[PDB]
């Protein structure tokens, strides 16, 4: 219910036995972030990617 | 009738052979008028995602609930320059065929938004458990059949071959009027040889998330939609489509296949739109039963092998309302089985045997602490299980009748228990299956590894299924969970009219 | 790093959120996907924001 | 509960394990005294046509709907010049049986008049359409177990052997609690070698045509009949009873068997008369459901093979009343396969695969034209089709694993599309399933042939089936289609009362 | 209303895809909180019998109806002088497994007592017949899955091997999703070698009898009770559990396995007790349905074999009141089988085929004079016999092609006929399914031996299952058979409302 | 040249009951017309109505 809540998404690092990482992360969160998302504009700050 | 303890009330009922007189009435069935089928080719196809976007053709056009997607493909196999040779064609006769069900298994997640309100499911892990029941033979043989449809019986592929029951076998050698095996699926082989294989065909997969339905029963369609649209994001690996036999390796072993490549072409959704007749009107706002699948999973470090037991406590999770049903099973860790694909390709899909489970629900601990695993099976085979007890508690000794050898064990499949909530948990007074708001539960459950070669690092899952009633209007897309209230569940007047079976029918 | 002003996307149904799912891709012409790959030494980081619609818009 | 967009109403149910209270009754089950049975032997059978007549005892005895006719027989085969070869016993363990179903396949037409109004069904080809359609496993394995009744699933016997689901194998070799293959049905062999063979037995077949029923449940049996006479008339050819596999015959197209003759000894037919209780009487005049199959057939000159596609045009027709159900299967022609027995004995009972169909009901064209073959299968299964998607549209990639042969393709079975007009075509408003007027159809359609072995000239079909009511009173037999008026049908007070599915059962 | 000899009124029904407006009500299911399972070890267990005794948690706690007992064992075999050599492992790969349902068939008679009133049935002779009768695929592959369950379809184990469909084989050879052969069951093994073997394992078996049920559905749990107890009084032979095959042993009737000795450990029986929810109460005296099935037999000394024909007569008996159903069947040699270890182990439980049967009720004889042996299979599969016609009356023609080996006939299980008394036999009006009292019945019938090797010496059982009410109230529990009186049966108001195919579902 | 068959008369809506009506199968005309000899040779007659 509060006016605004931030969330952080980070992906660590996972190689195959064959050295490769999928830059995807996915996660079921053990407890809801927004109580009811009908009244939120979602937007993103500060995202960053290793392009090495 | 009378004359036993309390006096009973009496009715006579006619036999079948003769009624003969009863009040018979001619009935006219009326659904109209034009019934159709469209093929919305997926816009923007790729190796990463298919995306369809398709709006109902006309005003007040009801939309049928079986939806699916066909996708023409191409694959090539290449030999791995170790263990060679390597004699004999890469693809074998009763050794290698599609994983069931293929597309769904390699889908990270699929999304669809009915009328601007989003609904999504998690196809990858949910499936192989949701597929195990509530399936009967009738239904298995029907709608489901289009996608490769047979399960994984054996704990590991090596042993299986060759059985009258073997999972990946060619169509001949499957007993008449019974689930056929995954080698049946017809697609052309362009060239098969040592060092090279390449194949092409076209696979139909069902859309699997309710409201849409996959069990053969039929129920109202969703008028009055404005715009449906789907979205398929493919799971990164893409090798997981294929299955294999650990046998063909052999003895080193670097599996003879050294790799694979999988390619796609435009694939098309297939929806059907009926439109109703003028005389009979459909109401401007209608309501539907919509369920919700979510999965909460846990990681672990300590492994067992090959037949050692242990214990695992789950992770505290919170659920927004009492779920209708709840699934709970152990499995070989996803984290691993992903690197080094050959294991990924030849690794089967079966669950460690649940020795006992003990669950602490809201305000309880140790619920079903004293139920013999045997007990955990009887409920529910009732809910729908459809596998035989022998499969549950996986093991079978098959002796070999020759001196002198050790006899040998096989492992078949794990139990995949479930507890309907008001039935097998016992729901506290003045509260019922529908009710909001919050609760939370964690299941601490001992289990064993039974697969006879590999060292199985485990994980736990928990697939919950909420019951909600969503309204589709034009244009609106209301959805509600916990529609009942506390006062209403107390002193709701009961009925002798309907009975728990009919309730059983609705899902699905 | 965002530099202003807030750029908004919308949100729709009334399901309490249970999953953060995110995919990153890099594209070349001719426009093929190629899902991005993270090198041995670095961590990949987004951030997010929800704002209550009522503060932003009448 | 009143928590939804529109308030909804609540009720409670009790979980199966506890009511524990609700009103119980005691239901005594009254059935008229003196059920009897009797074999009525054929008054003047022959080799050409045989026919029985029986009269029910009186006005008040209710005959039952399930009738069947058992017939004893002998045969004799004799090895021809100049094939041999001529080695091994003239019959072989995996290769020989009766056609499912044996005397049904030979009947040119079965006529049976009731109470003085004659209703008849042609049976040579109409029987195989109806055969695959409505039965499920549990009912297939009941009454319909008396005739050798396992459906031919490959496109030619030649390939079948030896699969443990091969359509004509020996009892052992057929999996446990399943549909057992054709070969298993017993009759004694007096002799067998090369150059000669002779078998004797007694084959049951239950007379098919409605009213009389072949599906398990009982509906009130015809009464009050006054008199009833069946009579068959068989195809002169008669050689069709026996079926034989291809492999054994040698190359140069020479056939081991040809030729042979059949014999029949006077056959019988078992009716079951029941008579009601003293006090409960049957109404003077009653009313039963009255179905009516028909067949329309169109053959062409053009031919396709061994797997090339074609499109074709069915002849135009005019239909008196919209029928309940329709069947549209195209099969290898009848013009050929009555000429020159070895082929006549040999040919299987499968039809060509449907690449798609385009249909026109009245004044519209293009109905179903964009619906992919896969869609047809789904609606057909929904009607009860019962066969897996793999065989419908059949072909199979069974792959070789030897350096370096090519990899065999198998022609498998056939597809037989069915539509229900209210369910599937959609009838214009004011019109419904029973109503009368003149609606012309003409079903164009494209087809591929699949068996690898022979060229085929194909004759298309359309079976239609009207639903009427027929009243029996002694002795009268009024019958009427569409009972059923345009204004009455339009007004249509509609009951949210009866389900669809229960309605589904009293087929058909 | 309109157009039939008799106008019959109309109602229109909406197609399944389109309701779409009807009173949709949210329904909640409510059952008492906490259902918990307790394992009672058994004090006072021996090789001569098992003894259980159990206090409920209290009164006011509904005890669920499903019950079962899990028992651990220890068997050792030893080699036989002097048919030897008996090269190769004492126990064979496909050859030898558990009989089914092992602990049930061994039990000489079983007694339980609800709350003071004793209710017991005999297990040893009853079960192998009552087994067949009310199971499809789903129901047999469900609860009854736990004990071995595959029937003895073959007339001797000699002929079976090596068949895909063989009665007792390893799980490897079976058809996906169907009943497994008895061999699959786990028999954890200590050692085996020619001259010895030792197996050890735990086996589950469900209590059979009324009320407690072994069927698929489930109904209201017994309450309210104070005491319950079970007594298994085992049979004195105890070697019968294991089953052998004659092919292995030749040729003086000297067999590998003689002799051996079984042992049990302490068994425990599991039952779960639901407690209802405080708010909605359960009444002080509840009334259930109660069945009980008393067998009647006869001993004959007239010997017939290998396939000679004969006729018999039962001897008179005097049933107290009409029984709900009646299973008649000849079965081999009860006295004869027991002598010899050899006999107990290597013989199946099939019964000879009824060539024809005649029967007498009270006051009429020649009921079913001329009903074809086949006509007797037509009913019942109406009362769910659950096998093919072919296997009923089973004889098997299997031909062998070489010159010259005579083709061989094969033994098979024979028919076990049944008849519910209202439905077939017909009844003097004023007599129904419940009413007391006296009646007298003698069965005559002709059977023919069908297996090859052993000459059978017959005896024929006649089980009869009565119907009746039982009221369980806390102090004491009472029951009447003959709950109906004569004047009440006559003139009982008849109900078009309830369907008859519902009474199929009741039991059991 | 003497094998039997069945035939479905096409549907036909009338306004007023006809006093009488005559049904008869016969040799189909088109054939009779094509080719001069064929055209002269073949008579008027019909096929015998079995029922």
Automatic annotation (TrEMBL), chain C:
Residues of the full protein shown: 316 to 373 of 378
Record protein name field: Minor virion protein
Domain of life: Viruses
